[PDB]
Amino acid sequence: ERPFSDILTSIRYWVIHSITVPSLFIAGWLFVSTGLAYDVFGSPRPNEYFTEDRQDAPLITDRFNALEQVKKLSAQ
Amino acid sequence: IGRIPLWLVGTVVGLLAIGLLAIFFYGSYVGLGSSL
Amino acid sequence: GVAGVFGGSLFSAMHGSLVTSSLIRETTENESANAGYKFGQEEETYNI
Amino acid sequence: VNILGLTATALFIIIPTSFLLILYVKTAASE
Amino acid sequence: VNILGLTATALFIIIPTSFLLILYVKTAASE
Amino acid sequence: IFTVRWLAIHAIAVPTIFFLGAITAMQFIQR
Amino acid sequence: GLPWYRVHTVVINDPGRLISVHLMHTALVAGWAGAMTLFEIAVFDPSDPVLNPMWRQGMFVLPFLTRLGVTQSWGGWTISGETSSNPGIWSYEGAAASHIVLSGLLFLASVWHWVYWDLELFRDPRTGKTALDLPKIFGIHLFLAGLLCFGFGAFHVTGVFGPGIWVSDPYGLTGSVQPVAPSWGAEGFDPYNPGGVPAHHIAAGILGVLAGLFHLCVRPSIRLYFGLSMGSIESVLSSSIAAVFWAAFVVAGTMWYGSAATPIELFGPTRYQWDQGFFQQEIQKRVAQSTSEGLSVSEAWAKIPEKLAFYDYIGNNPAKGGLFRTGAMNSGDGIAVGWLGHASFKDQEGRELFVRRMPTFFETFPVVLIDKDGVVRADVPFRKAESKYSIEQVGVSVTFYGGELNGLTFTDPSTVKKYARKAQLGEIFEFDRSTLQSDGVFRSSPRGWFTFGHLSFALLFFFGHIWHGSRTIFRDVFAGIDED
Amino acid sequence: MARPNPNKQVVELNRSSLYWGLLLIFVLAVLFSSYIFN
Amino acid sequence: MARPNPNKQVVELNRSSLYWGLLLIFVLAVLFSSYIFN
Amino acid sequence: IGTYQEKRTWFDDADDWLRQDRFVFVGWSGLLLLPCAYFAVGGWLTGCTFVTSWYTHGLASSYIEGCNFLTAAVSTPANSLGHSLLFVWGPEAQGDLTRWFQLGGLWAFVALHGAFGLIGFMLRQFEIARSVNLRPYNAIAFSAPIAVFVSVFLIYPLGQSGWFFAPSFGVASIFRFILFFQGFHNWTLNPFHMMGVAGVLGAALLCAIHGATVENTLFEDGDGANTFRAFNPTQAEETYSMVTANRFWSQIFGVAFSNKRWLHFFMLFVPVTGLWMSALGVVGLALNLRAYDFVSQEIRAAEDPEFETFYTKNILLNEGIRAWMAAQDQPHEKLTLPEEVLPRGNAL
Amino acid sequence: MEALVYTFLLIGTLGIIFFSIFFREPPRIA
Amino acid sequence: MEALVYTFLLIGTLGIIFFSIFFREPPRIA
Amino acid sequence: EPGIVTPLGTLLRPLNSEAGKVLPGWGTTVLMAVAILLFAVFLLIILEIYNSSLILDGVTNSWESLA
Amino acid sequence: QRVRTVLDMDDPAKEETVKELRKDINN
Amino acid sequence: SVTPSLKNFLLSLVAGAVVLAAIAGAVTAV
Ligand code: CLA
Ligand code: CLA
Ligand code: CLA
Ligand code: CLA
Ligand SMILES: CC1=C(/C=C/C(C)=C/C=C/C(C)=C/C=C/C=C(C)/C=C/C=C(C)/C=C/C2=C(C)CCCC2(C)C)C(C)(C)CCC1
Ligand SMILES: CC1=C(/C=C/C(C)=C/C=C/C(C)=C/C=C/C=C(C)/C=C/C=C(C)/C=C/C2=C(C)CCCC2(C)C)C(C)(C)CCC1
Ligand SMILES: CC1=C(/C=C/C(C)=C/C=C/C(C)=C/C=C/C=C(C)/C=C/C=C(C)/C=C/C2=C(C)CCCC2(C)C)C(C)(C)CCC1
Ligand SMILES: [Fe+2]
Ligand code: NA
Numbered sequence A: 001e002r003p004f005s006d007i008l009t010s011i012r013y014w015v016i017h018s019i020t021v022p023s024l025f026i027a028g029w030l031f032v033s034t035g036l037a038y039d040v041f042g043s044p045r046p047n048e049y050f051t052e053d054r055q056d057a058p059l060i061t062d063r064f065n066a067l068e069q070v071k072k073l074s075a076q
Numbered sequence B: 001i002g003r004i005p006l007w008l009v010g011t012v013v014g015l016l017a018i019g020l021l022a023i024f025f026y027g028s029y030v031g032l033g034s035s036l
Numbered sequence C: 001g002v003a004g005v006f007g008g009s010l011f012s013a014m015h016g017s018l019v020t021s022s023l024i025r026e027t028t029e030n031e032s033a034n035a036g037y038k039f040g041q042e043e044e045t046y047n048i
Numbered sequence D, E: 001v002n003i004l005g006l007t008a009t010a011l012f013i014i015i016p017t018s019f020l021l022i023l024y025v026k027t028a029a030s031e
Numbered sequence F: 001i002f003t004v005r006w007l008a009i010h011a012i013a014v015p016t017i018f019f020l021g022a023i024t025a026m027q028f029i030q031r
Numbered sequence G: 001g002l003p004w005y006r007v008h009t010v011v012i013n014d015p016g017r018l019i020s021v022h023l024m025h026t027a028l029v030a031g032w033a034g035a036m037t038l039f040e041i042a043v044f045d046p047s048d049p050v051l052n053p054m055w056r057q058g059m060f061v062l063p064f065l066t067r068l069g070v071t072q073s074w075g076g077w078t079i080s081g082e083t084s085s086n087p088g089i090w091s092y093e094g095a096a097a098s099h100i101v102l103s104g105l106l107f108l109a110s111v112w113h114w115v116y117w118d119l120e121l122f123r124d125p126r127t128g129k130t131a132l133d134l135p136k137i138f139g140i141h142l143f144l145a146g147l148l149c150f151g152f153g154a155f156h157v158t159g160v161f162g163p164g165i166w167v168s169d170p171y172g173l174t175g176s177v178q179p180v181a182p183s184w185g186a187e188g189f190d191p192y193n194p195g196g197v198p199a200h201h202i203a204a205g206i207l208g209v210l211a212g213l214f215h216l217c218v219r220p221s222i223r224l225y226f227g228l229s230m231g232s233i234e235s236v237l238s239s240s241i242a243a244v245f246w247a248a249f250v251v252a253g254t255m256w257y258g259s260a261a262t263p264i265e266l267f268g269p270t271r272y273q274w275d276q277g278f279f280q281q282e283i284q285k286r287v288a289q290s291t292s293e294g295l296s297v298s299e300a301w302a303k304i305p306e307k308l309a310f311y312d313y314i315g316n317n318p319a320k321g322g323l324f325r326t327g328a329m330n331s332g333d334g335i336a337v338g339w340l341g342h343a344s345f346k347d348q349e350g351r352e353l354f355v356r357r358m359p360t361f362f363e364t365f366p367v368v369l370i371d372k373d374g375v376v377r378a379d380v381p382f383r384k385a386e387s388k389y390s391i392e393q394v395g396v397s398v399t400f401y402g403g404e405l406n407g408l409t410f411t412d413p414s415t416v417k418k419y420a421r422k423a424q425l426g427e428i429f430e431f432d433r434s435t436l437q438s439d440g441v442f443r444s445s446p447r448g449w450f451t452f453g454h455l456s457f458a459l460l461f462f463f464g465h466i467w468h469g470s471r472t473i474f475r476d477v478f479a480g481i482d483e484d
Numbered sequence H, I: 001m002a003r004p005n006p007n008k009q010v011v012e013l014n015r016s017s018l019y020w021g022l023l024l025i026f027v028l029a030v031l032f033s034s035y036i037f038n
Numbered sequence J: 001i002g003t004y005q006e007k008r009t010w011f012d013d014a015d016d017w018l019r020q021d022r023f024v025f026v027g028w029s030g031l032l033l034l035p036c037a038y039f040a041v042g043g044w045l046t047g048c049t050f051v052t053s054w055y056t057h058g059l060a061s062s063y064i065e066g067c068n069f070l071t072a073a074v075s076t077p078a079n080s081l082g083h084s085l086l087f088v089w090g091p092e093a094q095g096d097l098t099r100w101f102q103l104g105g106l107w108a109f110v111a112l113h114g115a116f117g118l119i120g121f122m123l124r125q126f127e128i129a130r131s132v133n134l135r136p137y138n139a140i141a142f143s144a145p146i147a148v149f150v151s152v153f154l155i156y157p158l159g160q161s162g163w164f165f166a167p168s169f170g171v172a173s174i175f176r177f178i179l180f181f182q183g184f185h186n187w188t189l190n191p192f193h194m195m196g197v198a199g200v201l202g203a204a205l206l207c208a209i210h211g212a213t214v215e216n217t218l219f220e221d222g223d224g225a226n227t228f229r230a231f232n233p234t235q236a237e238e239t240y241s242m243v244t245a246n247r248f249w250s251q252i253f254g255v256a257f258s259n260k261r262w263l264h265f266f267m268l269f270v271p272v273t274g275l276w277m278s279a280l281g282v283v284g285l286a287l288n289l290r291a292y293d294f295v296s297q298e299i300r301a302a303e304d305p306e307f308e309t310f311y312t313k314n315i316l317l318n319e320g321i322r323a324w325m326a327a328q329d330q331p332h333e334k335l336t337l338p339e340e341v342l343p344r345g346n347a348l
Numbered sequence K, L: 001m002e003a004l005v006y007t008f009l010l011i012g013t014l015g016i017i018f019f020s021i022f023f024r025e026p027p028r029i030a
Numbered sequence M: 001e002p003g004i005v006t007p008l009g010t011l012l013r014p015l016n017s018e019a020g021k022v023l024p025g026w027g028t029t030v031l032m033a034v035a036i037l038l039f040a041v042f043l044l045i046i047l048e049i050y051n052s053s054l055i056l057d058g059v060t061n062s063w064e065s066l067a
Numbered sequence N: 001q002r003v004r005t006v007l008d009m010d011d012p013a014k015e016e017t018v019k020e021l022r023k024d025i026n027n
Numbered sequence O: 001s002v003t004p005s006l007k008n009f010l011l012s013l014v015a016g017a018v019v020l021a022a023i024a025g026a027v028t029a030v
Helices: A004-008 A011-033 A036-041 A066-073 B006-027 C002-021 D004-029 E004-030 F004-026 G004-011 G015-043 G062-067 G092-115 G134-156 G196-217 G222-228 G233-257 G271-275 G278-288 G306-311 G413-423 G446-473 H015-037 I015-036 J010-018 J027-049 J097-102 J105-131 J137-159 J171-185 J191-216 J242-253 J260-286 J295-303 J310-329 K002-022 L002-022 M007-016 M029-050 N003-013 O004-029
Strands: G165-167 G176-178 G335-339 G341-346 G352-355 G368-370 G376-379 G397-402 G429-432
Touching (some): A036 J097, B006 F004, F004 J027, G015 G062, G015 G092, G062 G092, G134 M007, G222 M029, G278 N003, G341 G413, G446 J105, H015 L002, J105 J137, J137 J260, J171 J310, J191 J260
Antiparallel strands (some): G352 G368
16 A cells, blocks of 8 residues: 555645644534534533422333433423 | 654654643543532 | 453463464374474474 | 262262273273 | 262262373373 | 545544544533 | 364264264253153142242253143142043153153164164265265255144144143233144234244244255255355354254243243243232232222232232242252242231321332342332331331331231231331242251242253353354364465 | 274373363362352 | 383273173162162 | 356455455455444444433433543443333334433444444454464454353343343443442352453463563574564574473473463463353353352351351441442432431441 | 162163173184 | 361362372473 | 165165255355345344334233233 | 322332333323 | 334334445445
8 A cells, every 4th residue: 555654754644634633623622512412412411400390310210102201301 | 755754743643642631631620520 | 450451361362362373284183283382392383 | 878878879889980990991992 | 058069079079080080091001 | 545444544533533622622611 | 192072073974973972962861851850750749839839849841841731640630739530641750751761762773873883875876985965964854843843833732633832821820731723913923922832833834844845955056065064064063053052042031031931830930020010010900909899908818819929929039049049949938838918017197108129139128118109108227226217116017918817917016027028028928948948048940040051051052153163164274274 | 984983083181181170170179169068 | 120110010901891890889889779778 | 166167256256355455354244343343432432422321320421421531431221121122213212313312222232233343353353364274263262252242241131120230331330330240249259250250360370471481581593682673573493492481480380381382272261261151150140140148157147146257248248239329320229218227337 | 869779770780781791892713 | 077078179189289290291302 | 895785774875865966156045145134034023022122013022912 | 990099009119110110201 | 004113113124225235335336
């Protein structure tokens, strides 16, 4: 192929990656900072771990209606 | 082929890695998961 | 320490498996493969 | 008794049988 | 128990020891 | 590009840098 | 010479002596089946099918005899507690004797095949070398297996010609060996449906016959022949070991989770029936009914069967034993000789309390009495100082309904504590421990022992399948690499 | 093949393997005897 | 005499003697088991 | 194939490309290994970064919740889900990916993809060894990690009430799993676990000893003080004196290896045997068939208040572990235990 | 239990008889 | 009784160790 | 030298006389693969039924199926 | 007949009972 | 007839066939 030390010492590599790598870093930063991570993965924000109805940890306690119950127990 | 020295590349990469590790260690004492 | 004992097991098994996999044919199937090694032989018994 | 006689009988069978089998197998390997 | 474990331990000692001794004595007479 | 080497590198590297940016952003979440 | 772990390789290229060692193995296995049956008959006590069933007595092959129809003994007793006046040939001892005779005959056949190994049948007519036409042999065997599976499903388990199989109610009270109609719909794939067994065996036997005919006819391709090494018996061994541990995993899971083929009257309850409150729910539903109908609490608990009450007891849980707690459950907690009745707990205020039942994980569990709304109201404290919920402080009495203590009420805390500690384990029974010198620690059920043995064998056979597939694929480098 | 069985093989067990087997048997007995006696 | 022991002898037990020994052991067990179990 | 016509099909082209030597060998096993292993590793990283365990365990378990690398885990589903496969299309998630993440389906995703990735990696070992004509002892040795993974992450929860009691993929969750086995099974007292510990520790000892013995019995073979430059890969003769190694270890420890073969095998054999024994023990624990108590010692302790052994002390410690762990560790049991029933010592 | 031992000993003796008859060392005319 | 079994097993293991050390098959250099 | 001839061995001889006889090419490998994938789908069906990941109309998947 | 009462009566003895684990999204 | 679970299972079979075709296309894309 072509040695890794060959590619990593070339300036074409670095003019490609000085713009690709920070773009991915900023994309991850904005994914966290916009709340899109919370929206995609369902993790609660620090203020919405408890509601005014339940003040303890949720319990799924149901299998065939688990979707409906996690909808009820989640942050609306 | 060879323009920037590989040792300089590795030094910059290691500096960035050490900086990220230092940022992660700083984040253990601030914000979420910091006991405060 | 846990990484060391787990890695010691992993690397012992891997060395071992590797040396054992690359053993040079000196015996037949009705003998032990260990019989292909003689104590104090000068030649290497495996294909590194 | 029920169990001490059991172990006595088992040992009296197996240990001389082991001795005889050792000697016979070495002899038969020597044809 | 006190005696069934006793016969279990004695048999687990003796029967594989008998097997090993048969094979070893046959081998050592062969060589 | 589009080789097995390139694809195997990028499938690890691109999510790694994305996740590192994400975790660095998490370090500055003041609850 | 050979290592001790390679001795049995001397029959790899000897079909006659391979048949001989197979015949010897079959003789040993049949002889074990017969001898184990005779041992279990000699030590089995049939006088109480309700409180001392076979799965309380460590019976392992007795359930497998009872499952397919053998239910009577030559000792004049039936497994269902009735009287057998004509058990016939196929009793428990009859099956045992048949297996002993089969073992002897197979031993003789093994001797004959060991001596007369050099049969021209094993010689290839072209080259004169010893060979086995393994695809053709597999076709013959698959055809025979399909015929036997179809016959077993269409005549034995349907009751058309055989006796049927063991079928029970969902709560294990009125089980018996019955003919079973096949279920050809989706319910035929219900694991707990007994009708799935004849339908499976009929359909799979037909498919086995058709596939055996296919393998009799159609020769393998050269590509697949070389890929799977169909000329080597060790390839067949690796694939057979693979299929066998697949089946071992299937039967272990089926025995552990329960199915129509693993009845609780034969193998004991499952752990999930205790976890999910199966018998507890049924008992409480039967008590709630006939209370709405207008009976008091002293009756309608006497209406509860002692068999069901015994089922609702954690000492019959298969997951409460130990690796070295050996023998029968009777040797563990005594022979159950009577149901003491349901224990209802009340406080000084008159509200009803219930003992929190011990979960399956816990070797030991604290005694906790909880009200209807989920609030802990009493306990047996570990710290009898500055406590707030002890039996003495709360004033808990216990009243028994339906058993040998029916109508009796106990108010002294020293007895309320022991009855609450017993109610932690479910329904309360009296146990004779002097007969077998029981040590007061729970044993495991036959279904638990079966599952443990077969899961261990399944993993060991996964390793064996790996080893033999390795040996087949890498035969030419078995003694070493080519060095060039 | 012929009247004698051609697949005859001679099993071997040297002294080191004997010592390993004896050690395995006795160490298994030591380990499991406490559990068997319970 | 020498560095090895010259009094080296090989022990022999043919199949007829093995059968006689096995018969003796099992027949003694048959005879005496009724008394050992009492 | 035996000087036969062997007309080429698409299979021959696929095999030619798949088994071509590149930087990352794919092979036929790559089509199973690379997707499954990639998805398992990426799913674990994704869960430890973003996915919570707030609904299945009532726990914070991701970096976005404030956890670190030690305390983040992809956690098992809730016990009420039982042994459900937790398909994203399954009757629990029903296609909703976010609620599938919340319900613990990522654990089943990672576990099943990792199991099939382990199968693919073992097949990769087989395929590469067959390509280079080496014996498959590497795959035979790798059978023991797969046995451990199967028995621990699949067989044990399948024997228990649900995937909830499987280990959660994470550092502190594995520590939870370990302390749970101590308290609830007395897993240290299990002889199969004892054999596993002996195998692991003996294999670590064998690795260290060997390596030290080889490095200290080296032939000179050079002139410089750096011995690592005195070995060539194509060298025919040995690099270390086996004779001197044998003499040293026979005169130090009493016994030594004299056979290099047998030594490498023994180094293979000890950890594989230990891991297989531990896997059998975990299979026993799947059915709660524990080596928990010595009944004779329990009888003597019940009939004698003076009799105390370290075994009795450990039984007391396990009781404490279970009682103080249960309420937070098994929320489905809904144990609201008053402190007065919690076993305690004195003052402390 | 004791009947098991008696029957085992008797059938083991009969097995020894069977083997001594049918698997004896053949007398050689040499 | 059981103490006798434990002591016998330990002493037999130590005897096997003694024999494996001092009565080993000697490594032959040929 | 030949083997031992028996009447039963002569009867069974044609069933062991075609060792090493193969079809050229791939033969019925495609049909075998179709059968294998159908069997995999069937095993997945029964696994999902017994796992309660597949819910059907008349399949109770509990001990009440004994009723 | 009173499924609510039998539910609230099986619940304190055993919280893992399938009657408690089934159709409790309505609760 | 067809439950939602059965419909999702059949769609999952379709998706599995799709992803196998996709990885075959990725193999042949070289
Ligand atoms: C698949 C195998 C299998 C299964 C699941 C069962 C299951 C059962 N049998 Mg059984 N049996 C079997 C095969 C099996 N058996 C065979 C092959 C024999 C002939 C030897 C017996 C002979 C037999 C007898 C004679 C009796 C039983 C009894 C029992 C019951 C009591 C629990 C038990 O097994 O004891 C506890 C089991 C164990 C403690 C297993 C030991 C764990 C492993 C093997 C230890 C590891 C090996 C270790 C290195 C050994 C070293 C020890 C040494 C130091 C002494 C149980 C229902 C008993 C019963 O209730 O009778 C009615 C009884 O008395 N069976
Ligand atoms: C005429 C012969 C015969 C008959 C009818 C019996 C009858 C019986 N035996 Mg058996 N047995 C015999 C021969 C026989 N045996 C021989 C030859 C042996 C030595 C191998 C034994 C060894 C034996 C043991 C070890 C045991 C018995 C037991 C039993 C009893 C219950 C059987 C049972 O549970 O089935 C269960 C059988 C199965 C579940 C086998 C299913 C077949 C598998 C699934 C086939 C899978 C591969 C196949 C090729 C796939 C086909 C593909 C398809 C498309 C066609 C019953 C009295 C049991 C008992 O209680 O004894 C006291 C028991 O423990 N027997
Ligand atoms: C039905 C399945 C089966 C059969 C037909 C074979 C057959 C074979 N195996 Mg084996 N194997 C299998 C299962 C099977 N294996 C499994 C499950 C394991 C994993 C545990 C392996 C792993 C394996 C290895 C690692 C080796 C073989 C080898 C061999 C060959 C010689 C065996 C020998 O001489 O042992 C001789 C055995 C003894 C003299 C004593 C063994 C005593 C054991 C340890 C305890 C007693 C067993 C007990 C009496 C039986 C009850 C258990 C039973 C219910 C399973 C032979 C072709 C060897 C080979 O390929 O040679 C080239 C080889 O090295 N096997
Ligand atoms: C660690 C696991 C593993 C390993 C590496 C081996 C290794 C071996 N197997 Mg295999 N095998 C295994 C387990 C394993 N097997 C199991 C669990 C089975 C089922 C009983 C078999 C059945 C089997 C047979 C019957 C045969 C072998 C043979 C062989 C050899 C040739 C390679 C081969 O055909 O691969 C087998 C291929 C695989 C294991 C890959 C399977 C990938 C599947 C299709 C993924 C399906 C996923 C799907 C989405 C379902 C998800 C389910 C989920 C919802 C629960 C090789 C020594 C063959 C041989 O030539 O031996 C000499 C042979 O005849 N195997
Ligand atoms: C290891 C490694 C590496 C590296 C990395 C890195 C990243 C490094 C670095 C580093 C660094 C980064 C360094 C730096 C430094 C510095 C120094 C060393 C200094 C100094 C000085 C002083 C002494 C000071 C003084 C003072 C004072 C005191 C006061 C005030 C003033 C002043 C400041 C002047 C590489 C890759 C290559 C290779 C391999 C591995
Ligand atoms: C000759 C003859 C006869 C007789 C017969 C008989 C008498 C038989 C039998 C037999 C028998 C009586 C058998 C039995 C058997 C048994 C077996 C074969 C077994 C076993 C075992 C095992 C294998 C086990 C193992 C183990 C142990 C030890 C413990 C735990 C673990 C295990 C499980 C592993 C008749 C007259 C009929 C006919 C003619 C000929
Ligand atoms: C789950 C899921 C999936 C999958 C996915 C994937 C496959 C992805 C991924 C991904 C990935 C693959 C990610 C990643 C991550 C990564 C990370 C997060 C990293 C890291 C690293 C670090 C943090 C480092 C540190 C350090 C430094 C820098 C210094 C010194 C050394 C050390 C190492 C310490 C799908 C869609 C199929 C379906 C649905 C579900
Ligand atoms: Fe080495
Ligand atoms: Na204290």
